[PDB]
C-alpha cells in the first residue's frame, strides 16, 4: 500500500519523422498493446526511451532488456544497462541508441518485441509486449 519503489511508466519511440506519437503508458492495461502497433516508414532513424520513477530508496544495476521476434520467432536480443538511481521527484528516461528500422522489401512487416525492466536483484519491475509494423511509408 501503494506506492511501490519502482514504477515503469512508459515507453516512447522517439522518431522526429513521424507524423503522429509513439507512446505506450505503461501505468495502462498491458494486455492491449498485444492487438496494436507502432508503424514506422522503413530506414528511419528512431530511438527507444523508457521513462520510470524511484521514490523512496536506491535501486542498483537498472537493465533494460528486448527480446525481437518475427511471427512468433525470436530473431534477437538486446541488454542495456541503465544504472543506479535514487529516488527523486521526475520521472528519470533511459534511451537507447539511435537505430534505423529495418529497409527492403524482405525485411517489412510486423515483429513483436518482448520487454523487461530489471536490477541486480533480479526484481520484475515490469514485462509487457508490444509491436512495431514497418511500411513502405507512414
Given at each position: 500500500a ?18 503522429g ?69 521526475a ?5 537507447t ?32 509486449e ?9
Amino acid at each position: 500500500a501503494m506506492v511501490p519503489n519502482v514504477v515503469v511508466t512508459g515507453l516512447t519511440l522517439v522518431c522526429s519523422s513521424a507524423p503522429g506519437p509513439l507512446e505506450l503508458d505503461l501505468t495502462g492495461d498491458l494486455e492491449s498493446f498485444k492487438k496494436q502497433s507502432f508503424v514506422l516508414k522503413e530506414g528511419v532513424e528512431y530511438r527507444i526511451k523508457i521513462s520510470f520513477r524511484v521514490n523512496r530508496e536506491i535501486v542498483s544495476g537498472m537493465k533494460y532488456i528486448q527480446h525481437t521476434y518475427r511471427k512468433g520467432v525470436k530473431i534477437d536480443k538486446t541488454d542495456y544497462m541503465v544504472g543506479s538511481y535514487g529516488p527523486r521527484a521526475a520521472a528519470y528516461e533511459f534511451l537507447t541508441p539511435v537505430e534505423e528500422a529495418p529497409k527492403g522489401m524482405l525485411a517489412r512487416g510486423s515483429y513483436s518485441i518482448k520487454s523487461r525492466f530489471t536490477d541486480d536483484d533480479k526484481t520484475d519491475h515490469l514485462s509487457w509486449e508490444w509491436n512495431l509494423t514497418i511500411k513502405k511509408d507512414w
